[PDB]
Amino acid sequence: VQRLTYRRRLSYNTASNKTRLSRTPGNRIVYLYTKKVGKAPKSACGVCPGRLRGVRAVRPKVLMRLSKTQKHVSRAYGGSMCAKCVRDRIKRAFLIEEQKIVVKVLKAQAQSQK
Amino acid sequence: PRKIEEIKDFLLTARRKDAKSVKIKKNKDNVKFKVRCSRYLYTLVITDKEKAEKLKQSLPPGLAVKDLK
Amino acid sequence: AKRTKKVGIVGKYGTRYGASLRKMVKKIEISQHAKYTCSFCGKTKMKRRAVGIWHCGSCMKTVAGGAWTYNTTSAVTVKSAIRRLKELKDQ
Amino acid sequence: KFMKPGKVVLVLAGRYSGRKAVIVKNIDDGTSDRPYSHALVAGIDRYPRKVTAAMGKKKIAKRSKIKSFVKVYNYNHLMPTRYSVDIPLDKTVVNKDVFRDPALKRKARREAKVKFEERYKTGKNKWFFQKLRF
RNA sequence: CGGAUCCGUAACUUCGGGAUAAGGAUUGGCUCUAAGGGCUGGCAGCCGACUUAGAACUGGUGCGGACCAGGGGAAUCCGA
RNA sequence: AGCGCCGUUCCGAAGGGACGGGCGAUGGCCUCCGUUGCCCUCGGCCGAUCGAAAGGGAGUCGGGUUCAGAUCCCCGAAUCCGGAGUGGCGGAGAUGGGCGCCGCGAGGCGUCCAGUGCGGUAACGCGACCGAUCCCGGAGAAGCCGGCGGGAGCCCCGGGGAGAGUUCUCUUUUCUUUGUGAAGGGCAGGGCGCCCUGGAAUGGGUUCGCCCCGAGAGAGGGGCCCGUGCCUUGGAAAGCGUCGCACCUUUGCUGGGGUCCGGUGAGCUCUCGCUGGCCCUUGAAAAUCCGGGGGAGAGGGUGUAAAUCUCGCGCCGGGCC
Ligand SMILES: [Mg+2]
Ligand SMILES: [Mg+2]
Ligand SMILES: [Mg+2]
Ligand SMILES: [Mg+2]
Ligand SMILES: [Mg+2]
Ligand SMILES: [Mg+2]
Ligand SMILES: [Mg+2]
Ligand SMILES: [Mg+2]
Ligand SMILES: [Mg+2]
Ligand SMILES: [Mg+2]
Ligand SMILES: [Mg+2]
Ligand SMILES: [Mg+2]
Ligand SMILES: [Zn+2]
């Protein structure tokens, strides 16, 4: 029933100004500008639609204020990759190195005869 | 501001260097000891008047305590 | 509940654009929107993203294929001839 | 029934992801508090750095200082390996019950550290001590 | 004429349309009836939204009572 | 011919800066560090520069004040970015184990060694968590339109209180009002394509609609993100209607009630999230910032304490329009 006005010189409902109306202790409604929501980082080559867990989802310039404990995970590739792809890469690396060892000993056993 | 719940840290903050202002607010079954510092305003609330009447004298003298109301 | 006699997906166009044009576009309107069986996952989730781009919903293994179908009858025989030439006389 | 306390076992998920663990005691049926089959293992935390001919003995003694750890793990979070490390681990210091006491855990970790370095200095089983690049 | 509810909708056609085709009946007011839900306990008790359908009574056949608002059909020529 | 023009990476010796090491000189309490000159190693600009007062872009809200100003002035409460050379104070890294001796014991002494943090099986958590060239990745950084759900404001009803209107008759009636900002903590609520036990078909649980399941469903137990909602510090002493004591260029101060109990909704607006549809339309870059991999190097070496701190505080400044 009470129509209020903007507080800044911006007069266009663009993306830079997102106002939510709030009630002051003085018994009146007024707009408050909200910072754009920050999205959590996504892994590299891991699960595509799933963002990373345990990492704070906030604007990039805010990460200067956050501590390292609230920006990464304790495991290897904490804030860069997801949990599935880490063990995937571990198993892949171990298995391909075992296959290299296998092909090396195969070349050796073929050389010992030919 | 910062709310203080324990009995040992509010006095340590009140005996600091930037504790220039200490105010006492009396309310209905509530007593608030607000100590103003350079960055924050530490508030300790208590519902017992007996624990307040004996604690008001425990403040360090010379800090310009202002009893509100 | 049969709602249309002969016209199918191209019933959204209505009475415009002629009859033979709708009959010709319906054949590929059936295919470009129908889900296909993923040759890697095994599920019927192969919705096309853009022209010639087909990505799955399970593993998201995107593949480049035909513009209106998952694979073209020309590329099939091209792959067959490529395999034949590879096996003949050791590539 | 091939997983024995002799072989080496990689760690897939966890804080020590891929840290060259060796099983101290495997429980395949499962305890009462843990219905899943598991295996108490001991692994290396920080691998020893590279040594050369130009780096002196005072530098080799610093590089050889390694950090170990002890931990129980589920079979789904670990992968066995055909390699094996033949080092005697007395079950008195390293036990499944030391996880309730920080001093006992420190004692077990300190025992595992020396047990690992005495096998590392002789040069046997260099694959267990070289870091897996993944 | 013009909204809404209930029946009925032709020639032609690319079978998608024509179509609100065309042509008909009702519409107020005040009392009612029936149906359409949720919550608590080992089938019962309370809580609140307005929608539909039917009937009775009644006003000098007046009821979209102001405002709001598709005339229609049969054909030719051209342009999809 | 020429004022000049085309051209913007092309036909260019188009990086003047830094990590470290060495030689040499200088200054501050020459103990120790800060600089200067030279040598070695390393280092793709995607080419200077301009281009948005609606694009990207860190960080202030509540009350009061004038004849003309308000996120600017005052009060009160916060926050962002930079500085620390004789490094401001605390907490981490920092303090343990083995042998022998003395002491009844608690403990003390001599040698050696460890100590660049911990916990949970996990998804992950905490008060901090050594890091040089380099490399990798994310955020910045995304189209339009249907649906559905959550939150808030406004609207509606019922009760209570203050004030106001009608009362020839009726009406516990009608009208105005009935509060918690940024910031920090906790708890509801929402989302998860996140983990563990176990594996189903007589198929299952599910949406308004689809969709999902052996590449692990139903069920049970946990974790993560937003928490614009609720309570608390701010916070009732300000603000606002009410009946008053001084006073008409000295006008402040009284005490009460306000932070009262609730409910409903295909209701309107804003926001958040899930999902679907549309294609010969795929719906912007850059600056700033973060995380990870690598391990060149640095650090006291032990019942004394350093390399470093993205932790809790404290000090100083933020120019111009
Ligand atoms: Mg702008
Ligand atoms: Mg006719
Ligand atoms: Mg007609
Ligand atoms: Mg009734
Ligand atoms: Mg025309
Ligand atoms: Mg510019
Ligand atoms: Mg103000
Ligand atoms: Mg003005
Ligand atoms: Mg600072
Ligand atoms: Mg909504
Ligand atoms: Mg808040
Ligand atoms: Mg609502
Ligand atoms: Zn696939």
Distance from residue C6's CA to the centre of ligand 2 (Å): 28
The span from the CA of C49 to the CA of C68, in Å, is 11
B63 touches B20 (CB < 8 A)? yes
DSSP E strands in D12-120: the ranges are 21-27, 38-46, 67-74, 78-84
CA–CA min distance D82, chain A (Å) = 10
Distance from residue C15's CA to the centre of ligand 5 (Å): 16
Task: Return the half-sphere exposure (C-beta side, CA atoms, 13 A cut-off) of residue A54.
Answer: 14
C18 CB closer than 7 A to any strand E atom:
yes
Question: CA-based angle D42:D22:A78, to the nearest 5?
Answer: 65
- Resolution in A for the shown PDB structure? 3.1
The span from the CA of C91 to the CA of D2, in Å, is 44
The span from the CA of C40 to the CA of A28, in Å, is 61
The span from the CA of D63 to the CA of D35, in Å, is 41
Burial class (CB in 10 A: 0-12, 13-18, 19+), D43: buried
Residue B21: Cβ within 10 Å count: 14
The span from the CA of B46 to the CA of B11, in Å, is 14
The span from the CA of D5 to the CA of C90, in Å, is 49
D134 touches A96 (CB < 8 A)? no
- If you count them, how many residues does chain C have? 91
Q: How far apart are the first and last CA of chain D?
A: 29
The span from the CA of D90 to the CA of D98, in Å, is 13
Q: Which nucleotides of F are covered by protein (CB under 7 A)?
A: 53-64, 71, 76-82, 96-97, 114-129, 136-142, 151-155, 177-184, 192-198, 211-213, 215, 223-226, 228-229, 232-240, 270-273, 275-282, 287-296, 299, 301, 310-311, 313-315
**Helix H or strand E segment including A58:** none
Nearest to A93 among D14, D15, D132 (CB): D132
The 3 state secondary structure assigned to chain B is CEECCCCCHHHHHHCCCCCCEEEEEEECCEEEEEEECCCCEEEEEECCCHHHHCCHHHCCCCCCEEECC
Nearest to C45 by CA among C53, C54, C35, C30: C35
Q: Which of residues 20-49 of C touch strand E (CB under 7 A)?
A: 22-23
User: In the complex, which subunits touch C with 3 or more CB pairs below 8 angstroms?
Assistant: none
Nearest to C31 by CA among C69, C63, C77: C69
Provide the CA B27 to C1' F236 distance, Å, integer: 10
Edge-to-edge strands, sheet with D38-46: D67-74, D38-46, D21-27, D7-11, D78-84
- Alpha helices (H) along chain C: 20-33, 73-87
Q: How far apart are the first and last CA of chain C?
A: 57
Look at strands B41-46 and B2-3 and give their pairing. parallel
**Helix H or strand E segment including A19:** strand A19-24
Residues 6+ away with beta carbon under 8 Å from B61: none
Kindly state the tokens that stand for B69.
Answer: 């109301």
Residues 6+ away with beta carbon under 8 Å from D99: D72, D105
- A93 — contact with chain D (CB < 8 Å)? yes
The span from the CA of C37 to the CA of C56, in Å, is 9
Residue A61: Cβ within 10 Å count: 8
C41 touches C56 (CB < 8 A)? yes
Sign of CA dihedral A61, A65, A71, A74: positive
Question: How would DSSP label each residue in A2-59?
Answer: -----SSS--S--SS--EEEEEETTTEEEEEE-PPPPPPPB-SSS-SSPBPSSS----
The span from the CA of D85 to the CA of C37, in Å, is 47
